[PDB]
């Protein structure tokens, strides 16, 4: 009985979204000058991890980066000089995600264990120690992100996202809209809203304070592994196993553009935009990262400096360089 | 050149690298194992006999040692029962252990499908699978009982015989041997369907109370590691 109304609403959603399809991103932006060939070189080669690199994040200083490997350790790297700042052993050896707090005081990571523990980088004791453990999830932690030094948002495979308060270590609000494991999460520039992709081949817009789904974007045909917010906050790109990257807009409620190529028949692991947003840097299972023009939707360049699968990729806040982590236990910074 | 504090930073980085080097030796020496199976597969029985923490724990770690050789056996805890995503985490494990209840003829097909999906996974191509046909006592009692027949679920069982390679235990009834080798071979057909020599199957027969599982796993892991070394050397 209720399902009858659901079909009516679903038809209504398509009709309104379709009505706004005034012109594709390709037609409107066809006249812009081509981005051209973008060539990047490995400026710094970071090695030392024992197992595959799974996740990495850049700090607000554009110099320090955190890299996560399934050997059970987090290493803080001085990107400018390759010096190692800290070595944090991990109780759980299968960490799948990591984060770097904007203040540079805390680092969080999680994995197959249902805890995304927070590690304090700056303590008078002189060594990194665990300050809190967040054990509210019933699935593997896939992505944990900070909104403030007291609040961290986490995603896990139990199809539910949670918002935590570090001081009390409890879930202030719970997100349960997805029907599949959540793989990716990224915060807006103002931290007011965040988008996460799951295996249901759909991406949903979430409000931190309201705790409700503002918008949904199916888009893909298979699982979505990565998601990144556009610098202006009005768009976001997604990476999925369907071997195509899709760009979505929170204002138009439609897929702006699809980045794909015939030679690519493998899924995407990570996606990230440059500082200005004109370039989309994404990871692929074929051991190389392809650079896509956000507007022209053409292959600007290819990075093939990794011998194994690339799982993480991120751009500095200043857009000065992009780091690539791969299962070969090496991280390379490109500029 | 380098400033005074830059030299100290480089010294700290070198010390951290040295710390990492020591950790690497343990990592290679330590052997990681993945434990998989249904609820009736009796994974807990193997997990028990550990002669050598959180309610919502997503993964469990089991530590046991044989002949000064450290084995880490991992069992997944609280999860949504979907594996195609987090299974990517176990692409470099030494081996995968799959336990099955030979006794449940109804759930044998489910176990076979689970093994086939794991075997054909694109991320587990280079990882061999160790198969333990647990709870053979129930299988022996059930066959010997005659109340239930495997023919009802596996029609090919009506025209199957124990191969000459069989090595049944003394005093076992021929029906028990036929059923046991029928199961193992049903599993091998999936094992041999697409092995291609990159990974192999190690079937074993286990009971709810058996202390030889540790040595069986030791032998299987040693063989797997030796085969991997031979492949790396190019002699395989």
């Amino acid at each position, epitope marked *: 009985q209720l399902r009858q109304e659901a079909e009516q609403l679903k038809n209504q959603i398509r009709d309104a979204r379709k009505a706004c399809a005034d012109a594709t991103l390709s037609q409107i932006t066809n006249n812009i000058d081509p981005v051209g060939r973008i060539q990047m070189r490995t400026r710094r080669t970071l090695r030392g991890h024992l197992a595959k690199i799974y996740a990495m994040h850049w700090g607000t200083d554009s110099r320090l980066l955190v890299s996560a490997s399934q050997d059970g350790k987090l290493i803080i790297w001085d990107s400018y000089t390759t*010096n190692k700042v800290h070595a944090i052993p991990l109780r759980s050896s299968w960490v799948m995600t990591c984060a770097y707090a904007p203040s540079g005081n805390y680092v969080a990571c999680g994995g197959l264990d249902n805890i995304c523990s927070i590690y304090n980088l700056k303590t008078r004791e*002189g060594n990194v120690r665990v300050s809190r453990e967040l054990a509210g999830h019933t699935g593997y932690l896939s992505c944990c992100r900070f909104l403030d030094d007291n609040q961290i948002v986490t995603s896990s495979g139990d199809t539910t996202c949670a918002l935590w308060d570090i001081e009390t270590g409890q879930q202030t609000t719970t997100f349960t809209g997805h029907t599949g494991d959540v793989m990716s999460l990224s915060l807006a520039p103002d931290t007011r809203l965040f988008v996460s992709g799951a295996c249901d081949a759909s991406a949903k817009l979430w409000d931190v304070r309201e705790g409700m789904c503002r918008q949904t974007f199916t888009g893909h045909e298979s699982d979505i592994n990565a998601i990144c917010f556009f610098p202006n906050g009005n768009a976001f790109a997604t990476g999925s196993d369907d071997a195509t990257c899709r760009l979505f807009d929170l204002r138009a409620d439609q897929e702006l553009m699809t980045y794909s190529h015939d030679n690519i028949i493998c899924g995407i692991t990570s996606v990230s935009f440059s500082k200005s947003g004109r370039l989309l840097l994404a990871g692929y299972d074929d051991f190389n990262c392809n650079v896509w023009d956000a507007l022209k939707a053409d292959r600007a360049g290819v990075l093939a400096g990794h011998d194994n699968r690339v799982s993480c990729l991120g751009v500095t806040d200043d857009g000065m360089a992009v780091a690539t982590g791969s299962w070969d236990s090496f991280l390379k910074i490109w500029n | 050149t380098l*400033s*005074a504090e830059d030299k100290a930073a480089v*010294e*700290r980085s070198k*010390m951290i690298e040295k710390q990492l080097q020591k950790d690497k030796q343990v990592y290679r020496a330590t052997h990681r194992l993945l434990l998989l199976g249904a609820d009736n597969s009796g994974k807990s029985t193997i997990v028990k006999q550990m002669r050598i923490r959180v309610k919502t724990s997503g993964i469990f770690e089991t530590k046991f040692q044989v002949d000064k050789v450290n084995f880490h056996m991992f069992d997944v805890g609280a999860q949504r029962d979907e594996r195609r995503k987090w299974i990517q985490c176990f692409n470099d494990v030494t081996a995968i252990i799959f336990v099955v209840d030979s006794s449940d003829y109804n759930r044998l097909q489910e176990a076979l499908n689970d093994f086939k999906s794991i075997w054909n996974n694109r991320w587990l191509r280079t990882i061999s699978v160790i198969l333990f046909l647990n709870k053979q006592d129930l299988l022996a009692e059930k066959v010997l009982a005659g109340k239930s027949k495997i023919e009802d679920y596996f029609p090919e069982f009506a025209r199957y015989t124990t191969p000459e390679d069989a090595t049944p235990e003394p005093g076992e009834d021929p029906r028990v041997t036929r059923a046991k080798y029928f199961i193992r071979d049903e599993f091998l057909r999936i094992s041999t369907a697409s092995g291609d020599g990159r990974h192999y199957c190690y079937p074993h027969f286990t009971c709810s109370v058996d202390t030889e599982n540790a040595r069986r796993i030791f032998n299987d892991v040693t063989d797997i590691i030796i085969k991997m070394n031979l492949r790396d050397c190019g002699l395989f």
Partner: single-chain antibody, 230 residues
Framework: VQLVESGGGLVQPGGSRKLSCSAS????????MHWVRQAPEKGLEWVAY????????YYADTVKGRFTISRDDPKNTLFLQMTSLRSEDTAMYYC??????????????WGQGTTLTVSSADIVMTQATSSVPVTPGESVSISCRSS???????????LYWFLQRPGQSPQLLIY???NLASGVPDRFSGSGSGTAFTLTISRLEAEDVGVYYC?????????FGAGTKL
């Protein structure tokens, strides 16, 4: 964080005595230790340094050879063995920890010290103002000069400010000439041009009374200024 050092006493000229410095409450193995001594009526003076891994060791020329530095990381103890003690060696010795990494704060904690009684390429720090009369509520600027610019090519101006309250060990105020150490009031701030430096004490308080010492960390042979007493 706590550092307790012992071994002080009276030694006749030409004698030998051994100092000790035990640490607790923090990872002693991860912090490099420095020896700084103050004469009864003089400022600070660097003595020796031992790295976290005991690899790099440096000594002051005035005590070169005579002083040797050893530590026992398992015992969380830092030693100073001295031989052929001369008259000039009489001073109160403080062991100071240091950890060096990007964004670090070396010389963040100082021990109470131990009194010892005995029966030219280094950068010279100039502090003309021996003392300045100050009153609560006012702002006073302390300026010092260095013979060589401390601004290294990496972009860091290696300057350190230390405040030594009467009856208490020196406490770091500012490091790298811009950053404020944790636990210090925000009203403390400093600046410099690379060779001329200034430390500003806004909203002076009765607790601010003491001697301000400046140090340069560009080169291992550390040198300290004359010191300004407010």
């Amino acid at each position: 964080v706590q550092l307790v050092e012992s071994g002080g006493g009276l030694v006749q000229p030409g004698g030998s005595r051994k100092l000790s410095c035990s640490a607790s409450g923090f990872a002693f193995s991860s912090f490099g230790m420095h020896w700084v001594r103050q004469a009864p009526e003089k400022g600070l003076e660097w003595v020796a340094y031992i790295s976290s891994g005991s690899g790099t060791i440096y000594y002051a020329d005035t005590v070169k050879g005579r002083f040797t530095i050893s530590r026992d990381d398992p015992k969380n103890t830092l030693f100073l063995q001295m031989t052929s003690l001369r008259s000039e060696d009489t001073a109160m010795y403080y062991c100071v920890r240091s950890i060096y990494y990007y964004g670090s704060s070396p010389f963040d904690f100082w021990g109470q010290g131990t009194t010892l009684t005995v029966s030219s390429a280094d950068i010279v720090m100039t502090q003309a103002t021996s003392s300045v009369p100050v009153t609560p509520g006012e702002s006073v600027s302390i300026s010092c000069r260095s013979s060589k610019s401390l601004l290294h090519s990496n972009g860091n101006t290696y300057l350190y400010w230390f405040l030594q309250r009467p009856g208490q060990s020196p406490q770091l105020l500012i490091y790298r000439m811009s950053n404020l150490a944790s636990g210090v009031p925000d009203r403390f701030s400093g600046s410099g041009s690379g060779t001329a430096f200034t430390l500003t004490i806004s909203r002076l308080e009765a607790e601010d009374v003491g001697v301000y010492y400046c140090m340069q960390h560009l080169e291992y042979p550390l040198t300290f200024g004359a010191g300004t007493k407010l």
